[PDB]
Amino acid sequence: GYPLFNNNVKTKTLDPNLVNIQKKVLLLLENWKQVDPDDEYYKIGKEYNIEANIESYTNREVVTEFLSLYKTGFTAKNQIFSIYYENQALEVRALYRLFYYAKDFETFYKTAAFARVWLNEGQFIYAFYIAVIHRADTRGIVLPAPYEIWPEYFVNSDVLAKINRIQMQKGLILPETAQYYGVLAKDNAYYFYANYSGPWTYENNENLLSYFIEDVAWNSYYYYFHSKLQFWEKGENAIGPFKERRGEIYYFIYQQILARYYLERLSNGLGEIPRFNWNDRLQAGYYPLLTTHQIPFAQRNGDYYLANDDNIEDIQFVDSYEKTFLQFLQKGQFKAYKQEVDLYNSKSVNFVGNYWQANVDLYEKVPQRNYLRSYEDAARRILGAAPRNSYENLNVPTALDFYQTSLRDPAFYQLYAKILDFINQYKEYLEPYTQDVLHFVGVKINDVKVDKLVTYFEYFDWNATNAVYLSEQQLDTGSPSYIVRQPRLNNQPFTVTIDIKSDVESEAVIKIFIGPKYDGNGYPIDLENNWVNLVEIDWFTHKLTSGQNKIERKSENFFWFKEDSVSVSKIYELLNNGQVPRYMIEKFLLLPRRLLLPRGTEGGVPFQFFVFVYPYQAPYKEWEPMKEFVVDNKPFGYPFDRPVTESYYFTQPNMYFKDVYIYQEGEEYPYYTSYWSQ
Amino acid sequence: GYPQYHYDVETRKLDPSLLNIQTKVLSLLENWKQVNPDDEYYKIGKEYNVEANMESYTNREVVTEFLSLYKAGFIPKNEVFSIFYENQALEVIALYRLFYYAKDFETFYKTAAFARVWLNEGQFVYAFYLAVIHRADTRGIVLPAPYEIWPEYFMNSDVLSKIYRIQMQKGLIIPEQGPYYGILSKDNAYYFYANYSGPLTYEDNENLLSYFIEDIGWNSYYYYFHNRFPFWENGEQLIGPLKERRGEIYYYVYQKILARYYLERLANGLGEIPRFNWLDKYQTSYYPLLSSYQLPFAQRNDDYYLASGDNINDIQFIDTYEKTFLQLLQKGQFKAYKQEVDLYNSKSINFVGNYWQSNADLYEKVPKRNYWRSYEATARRVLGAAPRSSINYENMNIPTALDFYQTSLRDPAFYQLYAKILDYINEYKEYLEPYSQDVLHYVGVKINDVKVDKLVTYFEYFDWNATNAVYLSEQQLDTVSPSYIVRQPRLNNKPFTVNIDIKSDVESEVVVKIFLGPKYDGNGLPISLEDNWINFIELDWFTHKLTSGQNKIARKSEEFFFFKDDSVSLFKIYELLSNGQVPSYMVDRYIYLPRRLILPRGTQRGFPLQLFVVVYPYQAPVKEWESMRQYIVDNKPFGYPFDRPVTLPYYFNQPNMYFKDVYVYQEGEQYPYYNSYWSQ
Ligand SMILES: *[C@@H]1O[C@H](CO)[C@@H](O[C@@H]2O[C@H](CO)[C@@H](O[C@@H]3O[C@H](CO[C@H]4O[C@H](CO)[C@@H](O)[C@H](O[C@H]5O[C@H](CO)[C@@H](O)[C@H](O)[C@@H]5O)[C@@H]4O)[C@@H](O)[C@H](O[C@H]4O[C@H](CO)[C@@H](O)[C@H](O)[C@@H]4O[C@H]4O[C@H](CO)[C@@H](O)[C@H](O)[C@@H]4O)[C@@H]3O)[C@H](O)[C@H]2NC(C)=O)[C@H](O)[C@H]1NC(C)=O
Ligand SMILES: *[C@@H]1O[C@H](CO)[C@@H](O[C@@H]2O[C@H](CO)[C@@H](O[C@@H]3O[C@H](CO[C@H]4O[C@H](CO)[C@@H](O)[C@H](O)[C@@H]4O)[C@@H](O)[C@H](O[C@H]4O[C@H](CO)[C@@H](O)[C@H](O)[C@@H]4O[C@H]4O[C@H](CO)[C@@H](O)[C@H](O)[C@@H]4O)[C@@H]3O)[C@H](O)[C@H]2NC(C)=O)[C@H](O)[C@H]1NC(C)=O
Ligand SMILES: *[C@@H]1O[C@H](CO)[C@@H](O[C@@H]2O[C@H](CO)[C@@H](O[C@@H]3O[C@H](CO[C@H]4O[C@H](CO)[C@@H](O)[C@H](O[C@H]5O[C@H](CO)[C@@H](O)[C@H](O)[C@@H]5O)[C@@H]4O)[C@@H](O)[C@H](O[C@H]4O[C@H](CO)[C@@H](O)[C@H](O)[C@@H]4O)[C@@H]3O)[C@H](O)[C@H]2NC(C)=O)[C@H](O)[C@H]1NC(C)=O
Ligand SMILES: *[C@@H]1O[C@H](CO)[C@@H](O[C@@H]2O[C@H](CO)[C@@H](O[C@@H]3O[C@H](CO)[C@@H](O)[C@H](O)[C@@H]3O)[C@H](O)[C@H]2NC(C)=O)[C@H](O)[C@H]1NC(C)=O
Ligand SMILES: [Cu+2]
């Protein structure tokens, strides 16, 4: 038994002008798996002609390319779509460009209706989601959470089977027994209790942390990161002025993800992330209970040999792609891809990041190439263990083929740990920070206190109606509400109080990180090795007056976390009053606040907080359009963006380390969801 | 920083007729690594001749065989001795047989002096310890703990290096700097702070539980078990009245040793004991920091291949042995080694045990065989990873942790090997018919409630004497030896009481058993009894009288049947002897696990466990088991009722049975390595 999560949403008034657009957008996301002839968009899609409206798109080459591709024929409907399939990616890129270069919202809406009427549902939904995220005229509009757009990618096969059975039966035949199978009928809705994957899916005791790696928002964060910065889009059209910091963002995001995963492993007593050899076999078994269009996901055994007859070529490429990088480390200063690279300079980070993502920016200076390869794509194909075939119309889906399910596979963490190890080998070049840059003359942190740190499991409900196929009557009048109620990790509110002394009155920036204290072997971790495992949790500014100062920062005001998203019904309810969930418009790309702390234990799990105070400097001018994600001009992860070589010279009076303990209240495990346990 | 261990010793008056033997024994164990010409035993041994006193030994063939082997020549002094070395095993067995059959204590003392003067020190000490444990006229005296007789087998190389440096320097050149390196000079003695092995020795995060597997009490318990029931000795001499239960004992002890170990793995989040295949690379490595006579112990590299050509023969034998047992399981009833065996009968356990130990009792009905091979010895040799040249050549051996019973429990492979053996034995056990309700249900007795006080564990400093590890000078031998004391953290638990409420319709004598076991497995799921019956550890076993109505039973952990107190140091033994008293537990309770190791620690600072309480009717043991009353409480098999597989758990939901969920907490430092100068 767990408490039910109820919390009012902090909403904000929406501009009336955008109201209509909001409506239309939602209308295009309803039952996207099916085409309803009676809907308004159907006639527009069946009658719209892009060529006749070629003047309505700013760029003409995009229209010509899209028409040329469409003449050849796009993929059929009711087929699995993945961005890692070359032909499908080629088609969806053209569709997205056509969406992006539409003159106005009317043309974009017409094109979206046409795409939904004629094109594959998966490609349409992907392109429409990305375009709505990126289109300027749609900026400020609320989108449904990814787990409500692709429910089948965020729930296991048993719950979906129960939902499909209910849909086929159009209710319960013997309702008084459904309770014993985790199916509750109430308030014109059906609630399905769900468990997380167990040892059958995960080996080597990994299932102990299934509540974290299978969390809906944990994967939605990665999907949002992919959508905001997609590898196949140029920096100008995706990020704007932060184009030279793309590699920094890549490294920072992946390092933070791996650090949080390592913290969870330590909390569950699983140790460090294993390393593997390509010419040897992977030692991470995975048996996902996931399906799309009833097609099972690929399964990998415990001892899988990565180098087989049908993979040699890919293997070779991977190996080469690594060795070349090592050669660069020996050269230091070189010329690659028509770009001069100097590894002694920190800015080179950008190049490095792009090199390890094989994004378009890496090839912006060389002529348009028809020979395309990607290290990450080949690594994902090798690790997925799916059968290899030369036929383009037959694929076995894998968790690594979708950004919605990538984080469910440990191989993802191992691969990106290898990549970040290479990047840190590169980072070894950089000169360590000096005292003059670190010491804050006339500023000393006297004390730091933190309230009790508590974690627990609470029931959370999310709408999963899009996974089923509706009948004509349901489409015409109304469909039932299939709601998944599952346990999720959460933490109670806590406050951090910092007592500082400074006789000089000045502006300053305060950063707060959380990190581990002991490794898997039970020994303390020196800062010279723990600098890569620290997770930034807070980053803000404050004005210090002469004398004593006491700063109280609440967990609800941390910069790098948001609140939970809400269901579509509440979105419509608020829209009827001219309001939108503020956190679904503001800070909708950040991690949820419920995942801030790792799950604790009854006795308590030890961790530490790092508090850093340094001088403030305003962000640059041309950085003005993006002054909602940054607070100063320092690199992301400062001061831990480069290796710490001597802890003695790093510590300063304006830095503080504190040891804390995280406790658990209520049930320690999340599987107590039976009728007899409620 | 940790507190210091202070405890009172349970003492009993020593028989005045045994005041002479005790001293004598304690005189022959002083600096046993060296021979002092000024001692009486030196002259006695130098002048004593075995053959001239052939009439002083009950058996004559023993003397003849010993004389023949001695003429052939024994191993030279100053060499590593192990019972697994065949020639050394034969020589030491002959010497022990000569010791045991001595008609009187005087002849035994003369023979011991002769052996110390003329024979290898290791063989002498081993045989003398065994004989003192087994001789009839030595029953009642106290022997020093194994870790004080073989300090080098219970400490790491760093502390031994420090002790050797201090001995060579005859003190500290600069005393003020001693504390910064963990050496304290106080009260005419030198205290050395000792750590446990770290990740260099153990992989896969197993070092977390080093404190448990390197504990002196754990290895001393294993060595005591070996000494009391040697595999090469006949059961009749070892156990007279209950010889037929020998195999059962073999099953009961190991099943316990693994279970506790498994529990510790659950406390540190390490999971289940791995299983391995002989014909595949071994994945568990081991780098012991142990040395004997400055010879390093063998190191097993990770991914070591066990089926190389050099070992192939051994491998085959191993495999064959296993195969044979499986074939027996298909036969059910058969005749092996001229013994009729029926596996449908629980008694057959005896044979099974013997079969997996390759002990003497297995070959008692067949003519004396010059050909003999042991499954356990071959497996130990294969897993030791010592160079094959060491095995082939007789005058040279590289020691391994599996070659000594004082260090076997340090190696992880021991647990896996014996887990495989116990898996075979449980596959055999599947034959037995499960206990019925009629035998499990005690009509008229219902347990109302079971309460337990707070269960707390903590580390505390423990001091033990390691003077025997060094070689002393002539002046030290003459006047007095130096005192080198090793101070190390050790696990311990605070006292707690179990209170049981019982409602009885009638008055009668009953037997109460208390077991401990785990609740969740490595994957975090509850363990059903069908799989958890093997994981329960028997804590208490005692009789009681129930009167009609309500009754309350308060049982203190300091009274549990299956646990003992910590052994006392040699100086305290002398102090008590001067006052005519001896430690009772070291006298007759040394074959039981220390009480300090009852509860696990837990790395999360809180660990869930379960206690099982069962009450059943009392029946006195058969009369012939009269001289074993102190160790048998009733006629039930050891481990009852968890001695056979549980098939239908709802048979154990009886009124006279109770399952309780409990939690164990940790007080103070979670880790034992905070023992530096600046942390103290
Ligand atoms: C059991 O297995 C077998 C073996 O796979 C299956 O048989 C396959 O079934 C599929 C689908 O039913 C067939 O694909 C369809 O083929 C149609 C016939 O096309 C032929 O003529 C056209 C010219 O008119 C040629 O272009 C075709 O091939 C040539 O061109 C392609 C172009 O890519 C080249 O690749 C070839 O090498 C040739 O050069 C054939 O000769 C075809 O009309 C149809 O195409 C429509 O649908 C696709 C969907 O992607 C569109 O791309 C395309 O533009 C067409 O557009 C239609 O799309 C939808 C309908 O799907 C609607 O909007 C409109 O109706 C619109 O017209 C499609 O490609 C395949 O050929 C066939 N293989 C065989 C027989 O070997 C069985 O289906 C399967 N059974 C079950 C129960 O599972
Ligand atoms: C470098 O490496 C080499 C090769 O490994 C090594 O050489 C070997 O040294 C050992 C000594 O450590 C030698 O062993 C001794 O050999 C002598 C001679 O034996 C030969 O001759 C006799 C007849 O006289 C034959 O029977 C025999 O088969 C040989 O042909 C023996 O006399 C020694 O026996 C005594 O010691 C044994 C224990 O080691 C006893 O078992 C035996 O009964 C003898 O006991 C004596 O001492 C007792 C204790 O004081 C005493 O009680 C007895 O009464 C008696 O006096 C011994 O076996 C070996 O043969 C050498 N091998 C070779 C090939 O040379 C080097 O020593 C080594 N160097 C270093 C520095 O390590
Ligand atoms: C750590 O471990 C070391 C080694 O085990 C400990 O050192 C030992 O301490 C004990 C206790 O102090 C010693 O035993 C005592 O020894 C004294 C001294 O004996 C010497 O001096 C005598 C004259 O003063 C001399 O007569 C002795 O020689 C006789 O005995 C030998 C045999 O031992 C015999 O061969 C000779 O012919 C003599 O007959 C010897 O040179 C001794 O006086 C004590 O005897 C008393 O107690 C016994 C037993 O109750 C009793 O029978 C006696 O009548 C007398 O009342 C006692 O034996 C031991 O010798 C030390 N060992 C070594 C190697 O030096 C150390 O204490 C430990 N430290 C800790 C635990 O902190
Ligand atoms: C779970 O999801 C389904 C599908 O997204 C939700 O059904 C949808 O509910 C909204 C709001 O009631 C419907 O929009 C409204 O439709 C009415 C006409 O019926 C219109 O007058 C309103 O202005 C508004 O547009 C939407 O059509 C409907 N979708 C389908 C396919 O029926 C359901 O409410 C969700 N349940 C929960 C508990 O969140
Ligand atoms: Cu290994």
Swiss-Prot record, chain B:
Kindly indicate whether the keyword Isomerase belongs to this entry.
no
Keywords, alphabetical: Glycoprotein, Secreted, Signal, Storage protein
Q: What does this protein do?
A: Larval storage protein (LSP) which may serve as a store of amino acids for synthesis of adult proteins. Binds the A.niger cell wall component alpha-1,3-glucan, a fungal pathogen-associated molecular pattern (PAMP) that activates the host immune response.
A GO MF term: nutrient reservoir activity
Domain of life of the organism in this record? Answer: Eukaryota
Q: Mention any Pfam family matching this sequence.
A: Hemocyanin_N
Please give the GO cellular component terms listed in this UniProt entry.
extracellular region
Q: Which InterPro entries match?
A: Di-copper_centre_dom_sf (IPR008922), Hemocyanin/hexamerin (IPR013788), Hemocyanin/hexamerin_mid_dom (IPR000896), Hemocyanin_C (IPR005203), Hemocyanin_C_sf (IPR037020), Hemocyanin_N (IPR005204), Hemocyanin_N_sf (IPR036697), Ig_E-set (IPR014756)
Protein name, UniProt field? Arylphorin
UniProt subcellular location: Secreted
PANTHER family annotated for this entry? FAT-BODY PROTEIN 1-RELATED, LARVAL STORAGE PROTEIN/PHENOLOXIDASE
Which tissues is this chain's protein expressed in? Hemolymph.
Q: Report if keyword Lyase is assigned.
A: no
Q: What residues bear carbohydrate chains?
A: 195, 465
Q: What family classification does the UniProt entry report for this protein?
A: Belongs to the hemocyanin family.
